[PDB]
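Running this now, will post back.
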Amino acid sequence: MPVRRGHVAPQNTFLDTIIRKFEGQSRKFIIANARVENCAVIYCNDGFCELCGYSRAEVMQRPCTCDFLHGPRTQRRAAAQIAQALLGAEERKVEIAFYRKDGSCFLCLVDVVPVKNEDGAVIMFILNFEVVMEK
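Update: finished.
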């Protein structure tokens, strides 16, 4: 990429494990900035990492569309619906084939959940991932 933004301050680490134990952490999800046009990942879970076989260091400063995961089976119409879901103010699911780093494939359900701020405008997207059919 020709240019990138950082600005991530260090969080708590031990306490964050108590939130992860208390919360519904058992599914895959990532947080992306909705104001930036490409929708860069600003945060990610632990389940998304093991589901695809990448890492936070690789998926950080990337667009949340995950276009890199598209193989020969991947549906260009679904890749479009994920990109168009980032133009909407409301919740949206799209179904699509992704690859895993070991060379296996699967149908993923991608669900974007819009996060509004204190003024009632959408400023972050949470994208969740679920395996709907393993191939």
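The first strand starts at residue 28 and ends at 33. More later if anyone needs it.
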